[PDB]
């Protein structure tokens, strides 16, 4: 039997990981195929052919019939190799040509030898010949017919690639076999699908599955992970996160009995967080005694990448307020359907920089900061009430604040004499912005945000970046861009409706309607780019550490602990300033040790009175001049911290020292 | 006021309509037309097929003083088919106890009546409904139609044969029991085999089981045509639903007549390949297989019309199609470059180096080959298949700038290139352009008369696109005098006599595929040039064909022009000799493309045509005869005002379709002048090797299955629309009692959008379906295409509408709902509000006939259109005016339209609630249809309904009304005391069809509403005389009947038809 | 599967890896051919669940218990 | 990006192979939408232009 | 002084006038009220006429 | 203003765009109409 799954299945790594426990199947008996080479071959052939044709041919290919390719050299070379080593010449070739190849003193002067030479073509000598022009279908068919298929071009799809001649001339069937490419060739070939084509990330398996479902929907033996388990029965890679979806419906519990209003889907909640929170398939109440959320529903919502409903399929938004129209207070969970893996490490991260995140005005910034502060797994703090710059903190330290500056904007606008009058004039009875009036008001708002804010914002951002690596929160994309922020730029959105959250909040230095209009102004001020969900950043920040707790939480602390930081030489009359901290198994850090933390120079200015603290520690300021630390240079098997402040480990005055990185441990 | 403001804001945020306007239009239409998503037709159901499950309401009182606990079967943990409870109801839950491969993403799930169900009726058009509770009663008909649509649409599955096992217990008598997959599987036998349970007790369930018949259990018929193989089909007695069985049987019947065995697949593929590719099918007995692909011609024509409407006056949707066909031609066409013929036949022309002008160097620079010429040539050649939507005109840049001059060598060579290139186009006005490209460049030197002074002799030759801009001097050759104009006369003669003639190739097979072509007979393909098949497989050069004749005649025409006595003396002698040599050597070029076009091109085009994702769409080719020149090919998608007949509403309610496509002459001329074959080829072997990989695919077979659904959907849409609108089609309407609004033109569009969304969601489609029709008004829709000639003679094609099993099953479900509205959750009739204080235990859903009254009851004041309230004075009773002008007090029996109370809720509440609570009046509110809730109260305690009825009356709104609450007593199985009960809302008709059994596991029901297990349902069991297959469908569902389970396999076409490479 | 295994066994019986006498991929199309598989029982049903398990579940569907 | 979509499928441009990239274009469903080499060029250039430029 | 100035856009393209991301590109619907529609049309036609043009 | 406020009819211009589906006579009419702007005073 053959089973296809949406993944990348190898022999050794896939056997170790299994991926059946990862997809939910309870698995010797199963034999694992290898397909990284065929994924690479797909990528290589996708140039000179068409994706649809290649997919059709490859799905017509079957995987239980072992075969192999064999590239012959070009004609001149083939004749040459045969001439040099002539024992190999095949019998099939004609007597005259083979006899003249079995001779010395051969050269270009020979007449009849050349006659045979360009009268010779490889049609008879090697029978199934994939030439350059062969269609994808024929090549696949041939592999199924015979064990060996001869080819002239490297660009092939199939089993393997072998060289017929030396290099210089070119210029396990168990009961159930799993794989990652469905085949319709056998009448019964089973493809398992509990996960939808919407969420698989490889994009190559995604295209393959989409095309095969589009053209062969009625003839695919589709099954489920549970029936797969029923049929079968009778270094640790970090950032490999298993995720599921939650099918839950909101219930408006009256005095009498149950009443189900809407059915909802939460897309990519991680399994580990559900395990720690210990949610069960039953009903729940999501509200505090005060009237806000219980922070575990809040954590789950902030940890997801989407929240839609079932009857329709548009993006749904939670109502933070308790107002009638779409109030939500009770939740009943009714099972999880799909489950797969995901690489929580974003492609944007690259090498290490300060991280900047963009959130709307009516976000949950205070609550999420409070929740993230009280997070610890190992003997470290992930993101305390530090290393974080609030969005209002960029403009709070001015004699008129930016909020006060934009309060005094009704002057110079006809028909308005006060802030309340301005709010009445710009907002209609519907509390929906009037396009013309708000567009007019933006023409007065923007010059202040481009002349009164931007220089101070640039100076503050540069100063903050100088004295440590910090995560910075901002309201608009243009706010960070116009200040020349030197760091990773992330755009984030929350499922909840921010406007009602602004409407319920009070005492935000002015009228609530002013807050609504100001939030609209920052929203339109931002550029046009698709914001990713907050779930990506939150998962990146939290999830990898829990796996480290699972693995080395039992292990010795000092053996596992390690850190990197700047190393000022001892002979500097008046030291270690940590940069990142890595918690990893002993083998990982031993691998880390010999990596050269050189050619990473920085200028350190460390002069201050003691930062009030548990240990005697003065604060430093380091600026990186060369490159930055690549994360793959550090590891993928070891976690670390995203943000850290700069402070020197020890009095006197200060000076500038050109230091380098160093890796110290116990 | 801030609460109202935030409520309005949240409502305006949440009231967004779920509609997607077409923004990325060109790419989406092109992608769909080049490749269409295929619906999942066959799906397999492994669990028992049913839709009505029995749910308990009140827990059973198995501990009690009157009777010991050693009596009930629940004390012995005896599993029973029916729930043992004081009150049992039956509700609707589509696809419960099912194990399907693919879920249809639709489900009609009903909560028990003790819970609210207004969320399934406030879905469709209840955008303005503010409160979470309640729905607008004016869209109940649309909501019910959508609910039944989802019911039918997710009940479409095929039953599976799973397995059996001999019974090892004396319960049955050697019966066969079916097992179904699942983790907790032993809980299904007691449910699906009611007669297997023993009868030790005298409970109602035991009495019914004893009254049933013993010998109807499990399998009783088998189809085992083979040893060691699955039985093809079996018949089993199991708990099921008659409506579900009928729907799935109809679906299987629809699928069965699309089935084809590999014999005609072999035949059709061989006839498509014309023997070039041979395929083999096995000759032996077999496991029955199911491969539904054969379709009728009406569906094919309808889908072709849909595609034509999709490709409307765009000129960019069709370009990728022609490019793809050009690539397909290039892959298998033996003709190739030969990049040296043009230079080799010009390097040997004898000239004089003293002369400044050189014809060979001029032509070699004017006719530069770059082998994009072959791509352009193949695009032009593939454009032959689509002349009803595409007119492959020639590009304007090919024509000489301003006007040419015969005294100019470059202009003369440009005229030669244009003359060779023009005949290969599909433009109807190609001959007149060919005449005028020469008539333009020699004005003043040589003159001919014209029709008008606007379209004079010196207009651009490309500006003659209209069929009736052809000059009369060109239509009648005699106008051109042979003395004043000796050259244009000969050119007109050549154009009239040696222009190529049309022909046809007769592609395709109609046995498996349909006949998509229209305006033409089935099984034919028209060509602009004549085609004589070759009788040899070793081709060799010959000059006896139309294209070579045309090239030659052009050569002698230019030779005569050069040799003319009024033109030669202007040239020197050496240049005249060199040009004569050039023309004579270019006439005898060894180009083989003309013979390729004559012999092999039509054959391979006929090979390509069947498995093409856009089938050929052609109109007749006519040469030089401007009476049958086709103009205004048009399509319609709706009638206009009152004409219900498409033959009369078509000629003036159509939309023109067609675009011009531009190609350059320098490419086509190079391709037509340069080309060979491989140095030693044989046509049969070459074509076999080239086109064997082409026929392995099953894409056209997939588009046939897509064609099925794209025609099912339109009929379903019109049938559904015709029951909420007024259409021209004859439809049978059943749900006229459910209240509904007067739908506008936008309500129908919204309903149609919801219908197509549900259809595509269930059938798993990701591209546009039925959407092109939605751009027009959906109330009146019809499909028809037409085209007319120049002389006004018009022809029209109106495909007949085939039956649609989806709409048939929807109509069947509506008919069943007409009698069984209670199970889906619906009340029929109207409510009556008034005090009823007593110690009786009658259910409000089955009230005694004394309390109710109607319009014909004497002494009843019927209100309505007009009503005014006059306040009382000095103790006088307040009075409300009657509908007949009378004035009556607040006492008696009234009749209210529900619209009146909706319009005056607050006034009527404040004026009438006190009198209803304490006075004597009783109001009958005519409602038509309404959802209900059920609250069960303990009969031994004082219970009041005033709170419930007030909390229902205070939310009646000009928009929405909540569900009607009822109080139903609990049926006790032992004598109890009596306490007063006060009820306010009672139904009008017997509205208690949903009840199943009261006090099941108990010897009798003493107090309260009683009902034994319905004997009329289990008719097959209780009635010995009824045959097993007999069902009474429109009235009841019988909850039990015979169902046939299949085991047909669905293999790929390739795995059964190999192809013998 | 059986044809491919027979071809492999023939190739192993011979010394050449290639086979001169094969039972698979031959010209005759015999798709209809069936083999004695274990997926079906003697009654024609599928052995998705073994007969012993099916009988055990069928007989345990209705069993009595002592009174409480 | 959508100018070249319906004209050059496959046929990789100079040194840039064609590739695959999803899209959430219409309502909720996402496709794979194979792209040509030029469109991979455009994707890389678009990320470069969206992020900005680093200037030593 | 040269690389810190940024443009001042007083009437930017509305957020509702875009679509889902094709990777990292969002196609602009031709129903927009902004002035960028004509620029998008001109560049789109230019790109198409390039891609079809064979050299 | 009062007629616009109390008028049941709402003027959305997406109908022309959806019907036409976008020089050429198909696009010239759209360019001259400019349906996108929202002003019907």
Coordinates of N, CA and C in Angstrom, one line a residue, chain B residues 459-604:
Chain B
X459 N -7.8 55.9 -50.1 CA -8.0 55.6 -48.6 C -7.0 54.5 -48.3
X460 N -6.7 54.4 -47.0 CA -5.9 53.3 -46.5 C -6.6 51.9 -46.8
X461 N -5.8 51.0 -47.3 CA -6.4 49.7 -47.7 C -6.9 48.9 -46.5
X462 N -6.4 49.2 -45.3 CA -6.9 48.5 -44.1 C -8.2 49.1 -43.6
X463 N -8.7 50.2 -44.1 CA -9.9 50.8 -43.7 C -11.2 50.3 -44.4
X464 N -11.1 49.1 -44.9 CA -12.2 48.6 -45.7 C -12.8 47.3 -45.0
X465 N -12.9 47.4 -43.6 CA -13.3 46.3 -42.8 C -14.7 45.9 -43.0
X466 N -15.6 46.9 -43.2 CA -17.0 46.6 -43.3 C -17.4 45.8 -44.5
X467 N -18.3 44.8 -44.5 CA -18.6 44.0 -45.7 C -19.2 44.9 -46.8
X468 N -19.9 46.0 -46.5 CA -20.5 46.8 -47.6 C -19.7 48.1 -47.8
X469 N -18.4 48.1 -47.6 CA -17.5 49.1 -48.2 C -16.8 48.6 -49.4
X470 N -17.1 47.4 -49.9 CA -16.5 46.9 -51.1 C -16.9 47.7 -52.3
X471 N -15.9 48.2 -53.1 CA -16.3 49.1 -54.2 C -17.1 48.3 -55.3
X472 N -18.0 49.0 -55.9 CA -18.8 48.5 -57.0 C -17.9 48.1 -58.2
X473 N -16.8 48.9 -58.4 CA -15.8 48.5 -59.4 C -15.1 47.2 -59.1
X474 N -15.0 46.8 -57.9 CA -14.5 45.5 -57.5 C -15.5 44.4 -57.6
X475 N -16.8 44.7 -57.2 CA -17.8 43.7 -57.3 C -18.1 43.4 -58.8
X476 N -18.2 44.4 -59.7 CA -18.4 44.2 -61.1 C -17.1 44.5 -61.8
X477 N -16.4 43.5 -62.3 CA -15.1 43.7 -62.9 C -15.2 44.6 -64.2
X478 N -16.3 44.6 -64.8 CA -16.5 45.3 -66.1 C -16.3 46.8 -65.9
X479 N -16.4 47.3 -64.7 CA -16.2 48.8 -64.5 C -14.8 49.2 -64.8
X480 N -13.8 48.3 -64.5 CA -12.4 48.6 -64.7 C -12.1 48.4 -66.2
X481 N -11.9 49.5 -66.9 CA -11.6 49.4 -68.4 C -10.3 48.8 -68.7
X482 N -10.2 48.0 -69.7 CA -8.9 47.4 -70.0 C -7.9 48.3 -70.7
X483 N -8.3 49.5 -71.1 CA -7.4 50.5 -71.7 C -6.8 51.5 -70.8
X484 N -7.7 52.1 -70.0 CA -7.2 53.1 -69.0 C -6.5 52.4 -67.9
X485 N -7.0 51.2 -67.5 CA -6.5 50.5 -66.3 C -6.2 49.0 -66.7
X486 N -5.0 48.8 -67.3 CA -4.7 47.4 -67.8 C -4.2 46.5 -66.7
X487 N -3.8 47.0 -65.5 CA -3.2 46.2 -64.5 C -4.2 45.8 -63.4
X488 N -5.0 46.8 -63.0 CA -6.1 46.5 -62.0 C -7.1 45.5 -62.5
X489 N -7.4 45.6 -63.8 CA -8.3 44.6 -64.4 C -7.7 43.2 -64.2
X490 N -6.5 42.9 -64.5 CA -5.9 41.6 -64.3 C -5.8 41.2 -62.9
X491 N -5.5 42.2 -62.0 CA -5.5 41.9 -60.6 C -6.8 41.5 -60.0
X492 N -7.9 42.2 -60.5 CA -9.2 41.8 -60.1 C -9.6 40.4 -60.7
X493 N -9.2 40.1 -61.9 CA -9.4 38.7 -62.4 C -8.7 37.7 -61.6
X494 N -7.4 37.9 -61.2 CA -6.7 37.0 -60.4 C -7.4 36.8 -59.1
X495 N -7.8 37.9 -58.4 CA -8.4 37.8 -57.1 C -9.7 37.0 -57.2
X496 N -10.5 37.2 -58.3 CA -11.8 36.5 -58.4 C -11.6 35.1 -58.8
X497 N -10.6 34.7 -59.6 CA -10.5 33.3 -60.1 C -9.6 32.4 -59.3
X498 N -8.6 32.9 -58.6 CA -7.6 32.1 -58.0 C -7.5 32.3 -56.5
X499 N -8.5 32.9 -55.9 CA -8.6 32.9 -54.4 C -9.0 31.5 -53.9
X500 N -8.3 31.1 -52.8 CA -8.6 29.7 -52.3 C -10.0 29.5 -51.8
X501 N -10.5 28.3 -52.0 CA -11.8 27.8 -51.7 C -11.9 27.1 -50.3
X502 N -13.0 27.2 -49.6 CA -13.1 26.5 -48.3 C -13.3 25.0 -48.4
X503 N -13.2 24.3 -47.3 CA -13.3 22.9 -47.2 C -13.6 22.5 -45.7
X504 N -13.5 21.2 -45.4 CA -13.8 20.8 -44.1 C -13.1 19.4 -43.9
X505 N -13.0 19.0 -42.6 CA -12.1 17.9 -42.2 C -12.9 16.9 -41.4
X506 N -14.0 17.1 -40.8 CA -14.9 16.1 -40.1 C -14.1 15.4 -38.9
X507 N -13.8 16.2 -37.9 CA -13.1 15.7 -36.8 C -14.1 15.0 -35.8
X508 N -13.5 14.5 -34.7 CA -14.3 14.2 -33.5 C -15.1 12.9 -33.5
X509 N -15.7 12.6 -32.4 CA -16.5 11.5 -32.1 C -17.7 11.9 -31.2
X510 N -18.9 11.6 -31.6 CA -20.1 12.0 -30.8 C -20.6 10.9 -29.9
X511 N -20.0 9.7 -29.9 CA -20.5 8.6 -29.1 C -20.3 8.9 -27.6
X512 N -19.1 9.4 -27.2 CA -18.7 9.6 -25.8 C -18.9 11.1 -25.6
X513 N -18.2 11.9 -26.3 CA -18.3 13.4 -26.2 C -19.6 13.8 -26.9
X514 N -20.0 15.1 -26.6 CA -21.1 15.7 -27.3 C -20.7 16.3 -28.6
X515 N -21.6 17.2 -29.1 CA -21.4 18.0 -30.3 C -21.4 19.4 -29.9
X516 N -20.2 19.9 -29.5 CA -20.2 21.3 -29.0 C -20.4 22.3 -30.1
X517 N -20.0 22.0 -31.3 CA -20.1 23.0 -32.4 C -21.5 23.3 -32.7
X518 N -21.8 24.6 -33.1 CA -23.1 25.0 -33.4 C -23.0 26.1 -34.5
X519 N -24.1 26.3 -35.2 CA -24.2 27.0 -36.4 C -23.6 26.2 -37.6
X520 N -23.1 25.1 -37.2 CA -22.5 24.1 -38.1 C -23.0 22.7 -37.8
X521 N -23.1 21.8 -38.7 CA -23.5 20.4 -38.4 C -22.5 19.8 -37.4
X522 N -23.0 18.8 -36.6 CA -22.1 18.1 -35.7 C -21.0 17.4 -36.6
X523 N -19.8 17.2 -36.0 CA -18.8 16.4 -36.6 C -18.3 17.1 -37.9
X524 N -17.9 18.3 -37.9 CA -17.3 19.0 -39.0 C -16.5 20.2 -38.5
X525 N -15.5 20.6 -39.3 CA -14.7 21.7 -39.0 C -14.4 22.4 -40.3
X526 N -14.8 23.7 -40.4 CA -14.6 24.4 -41.7 C -13.2 25.0 -41.7
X527 N -12.7 25.2 -43.0 CA -11.4 25.7 -43.2 C -11.4 26.8 -44.3
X528 N -10.5 27.8 -44.2 CA -10.5 28.8 -45.2 C -9.9 28.4 -46.5
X529 N -9.1 27.3 -46.5 CA -8.4 26.8 -47.7 C -8.9 25.4 -47.9
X530 N -8.8 24.9 -49.2 CA -9.2 23.6 -49.6 C -8.2 22.5 -49.1
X531 N -8.7 21.3 -48.8 CA -7.9 20.3 -48.3 C -8.1 19.0 -49.1
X532 N -7.0 18.5 -49.7 CA -7.0 17.2 -50.4 C -6.1 16.3 -49.6
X533 N -6.5 15.2 -49.0 CA -5.6 14.3 -48.2 C -4.6 13.7 -49.1
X534 N -3.4 13.4 -48.6 CA -2.3 12.8 -49.3 C -2.5 11.3 -49.3
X535 N -2.1 10.6 -50.4 CA -2.2 9.2 -50.5 C -0.8 8.5 -50.3
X536 N 0.2 9.2 -50.0 CA 1.5 8.6 -49.8 C 2.1 9.1 -48.4
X537 N 3.0 8.3 -47.8 CA 3.6 8.7 -46.6 C 5.0 9.2 -46.7
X538 N 5.5 9.2 -48.0 CA 6.8 9.8 -48.2 C 6.7 11.1 -49.0
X539 N 6.4 12.2 -48.3 CA 6.1 13.5 -49.1 C 7.3 14.0 -49.9
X540 N 7.0 14.7 -50.9 CA 8.0 15.3 -51.8 C 7.4 16.5 -52.4
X541 N 8.3 17.4 -52.9 CA 7.9 18.7 -53.4 C 7.0 18.6 -54.6
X542 N 6.0 19.4 -54.6 CA 5.1 19.6 -55.8 C 4.5 21.0 -55.8
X543 N 4.2 21.5 -57.0 CA 3.7 22.8 -57.1 C 2.2 22.9 -57.5
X544 N 1.5 21.8 -57.5 CA 0.1 21.7 -57.9 C -0.8 21.9 -56.7
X545 N -0.8 23.1 -56.2 CA -1.7 23.5 -55.1 C -2.0 25.0 -55.1
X546 N -3.0 25.3 -54.3 CA -3.6 26.7 -54.4 C -2.7 27.8 -54.0
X547 N -1.9 27.5 -52.9 CA -1.0 28.6 -52.4 C 0.1 28.8 -53.4
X548 N 0.7 27.8 -54.0 CA 1.7 28.0 -55.0 C 1.1 28.7 -56.2
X549 N -0.1 28.3 -56.6 CA -0.7 29.0 -57.7 C -0.9 30.5 -57.4
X550 N -1.3 30.8 -56.2 CA -1.5 32.2 -55.8 C -0.1 32.9 -55.9
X551 N 0.9 32.3 -55.4 CA 2.2 33.0 -55.4 C 2.7 33.2 -56.8
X552 N 2.6 32.2 -57.6 CA 2.9 32.3 -59.0 C 2.2 33.5 -59.7
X553 N 0.8 33.5 -59.6 CA 0.0 34.5 -60.3 C 0.4 35.9 -59.8
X554 N 0.7 36.0 -58.5 CA 1.2 37.3 -58.1 C 2.5 37.6 -58.8
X555 N 3.4 36.6 -59.0 CA 4.7 36.9 -59.6 C 4.5 37.3 -61.1
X556 N 3.7 36.6 -61.9 CA 3.4 37.1 -63.2 C 2.7 38.5 -63.2
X557 N 1.8 38.7 -62.3 CA 1.2 40.1 -62.2 C 2.3 41.2 -62.1
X558 N 3.2 41.0 -61.1 CA 4.2 42.0 -61.0 C 5.2 42.0 -62.2
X559 N 5.4 40.9 -62.8 CA 6.2 40.9 -64.0 C 5.6 41.7 -65.1
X560 N 4.2 41.5 -65.3 CA 3.5 42.3 -66.3 C 3.6 43.8 -66.0
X561 N 3.4 44.1 -64.7 CA 3.5 45.5 -64.3 C 4.9 46.1 -64.6
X562 N 5.9 45.4 -64.3 CA 7.3 45.9 -64.6 C 7.5 46.0 -66.1
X563 N 7.0 45.0 -66.9 CA 7.2 45.0 -68.4 C 6.4 46.0 -69.1
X564 N 5.4 46.7 -68.4 CA 4.5 47.6 -69.0 C 5.3 48.7 -69.7
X565 N 4.8 49.2 -70.9 CA 5.5 50.1 -71.7 C 5.5 51.5 -71.1
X566 N 4.5 51.8 -70.2 CA 4.5 53.1 -69.5 C 5.2 53.1 -68.2
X567 N 5.9 52.0 -67.8 CA 6.7 51.8 -66.6 C 8.1 51.4 -66.8
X568 N 8.3 50.6 -67.8 CA 9.7 50.1 -68.1 C 10.7 51.2 -68.4
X569 N 10.4 52.1 -69.4 CA 11.4 53.1 -69.7 C 11.9 54.0 -68.6
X570 N 11.1 54.2 -67.6 CA 11.5 54.9 -66.4 C 12.6 54.2 -65.7
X571 N 12.8 52.9 -65.9 CA 13.8 52.1 -65.3 C 14.9 51.8 -66.3
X572 N 16.1 51.5 -65.8 CA 17.2 51.1 -66.7 C 17.0 49.7 -67.2
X573 N 17.9 49.2 -68.1 CA 17.8 47.9 -68.6 C 18.3 46.8 -67.7
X574 N 19.5 47.0 -67.1 CA 20.1 46.1 -66.2 C 19.2 45.8 -65.0
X575 N 18.6 46.9 -64.4 CA 17.7 46.7 -63.3 C 16.4 46.0 -63.7
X576 N 15.9 46.2 -64.9 CA 14.7 45.5 -65.3 C 15.0 44.0 -65.5
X577 N 16.2 43.7 -66.1 CA 16.6 42.3 -66.2 C 16.8 41.6 -64.8
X578 N 17.4 42.3 -63.9 CA 17.6 41.8 -62.6 C 16.3 41.6 -61.8
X579 N 15.3 42.5 -62.0 CA 14.0 42.3 -61.3 C 13.2 41.2 -62.0
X580 N 13.3 41.0 -63.3 CA 12.7 39.9 -63.9 C 13.3 38.6 -63.4
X581 N 14.6 38.5 -63.3 CA 15.2 37.3 -62.7 C 14.8 37.1 -61.3
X582 N 14.7 38.2 -60.5 CA 14.3 38.1 -59.1 C 12.8 37.5 -59.0
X583 N 11.9 38.0 -59.8 CA 10.6 37.5 -59.8 C 10.5 36.0 -60.3
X584 N 11.2 35.7 -61.3 CA 11.2 34.3 -61.8 C 11.9 33.4 -60.9
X585 N 12.8 33.8 -60.1 CA 13.5 32.9 -59.1 C 12.7 32.8 -57.8
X586 N 12.0 33.9 -57.5 CA 11.1 33.8 -56.3 C 9.8 33.1 -56.5
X587 N 9.4 33.0 -57.8 CA 8.2 32.2 -58.1 C 8.5 30.7 -57.9
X588 N 9.7 30.3 -58.3 CA 10.1 28.9 -58.2 C 10.9 28.5 -57.0
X589 N 10.6 29.2 -55.9 CA 11.2 28.9 -54.6 C 10.8 27.4 -54.2
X590 N 11.7 26.7 -53.5 CA 11.4 25.4 -53.1 C 10.9 25.4 -51.6
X591 N 9.8 26.2 -51.5 CA 9.1 26.2 -50.2 C 8.0 25.1 -50.2
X592 N 7.9 24.5 -49.1 CA 7.0 23.3 -48.9 C 5.9 23.5 -48.0
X593 N 5.8 24.7 -47.4 CA 4.7 25.1 -46.5 C 3.4 25.1 -47.3
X594 N 3.3 25.5 -48.5 CA 2.0 25.4 -49.2 C 1.5 24.0 -49.2
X595 N 2.3 23.0 -49.5 CA 1.9 21.6 -49.6 C 1.6 21.1 -48.2
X596 N 2.4 21.5 -47.2 CA 2.0 21.2 -45.8 C 0.6 21.6 -45.5
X597 N 0.3 22.9 -45.8 CA -1.1 23.4 -45.5 C -2.1 22.6 -46.3
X598 N -1.8 22.3 -47.5 CA -2.8 21.6 -48.4 C -3.1 20.2 -47.8
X599 N -2.0 19.5 -47.3 CA -2.2 18.0 -47.0 C -2.3 17.7 -45.5
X600 N -1.3 18.1 -44.8 CA -1.1 17.6 -43.4 C -1.7 18.5 -42.3
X601 N -1.8 19.8 -42.6 CA -2.3 20.7 -41.5 C -3.7 20.4 -41.1
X602 N -4.7 20.2 -42.0 CA -6.1 19.9 -41.5 C -6.2 18.6 -40.8
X603 N -5.4 17.6 -41.1 CA -5.4 16.3 -40.4 C -5.0 16.4 -39.0
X604 N -3.9 17.1 -38.7 CA -3.4 17.3 -37.4 C -4.3 18.3 -36.6

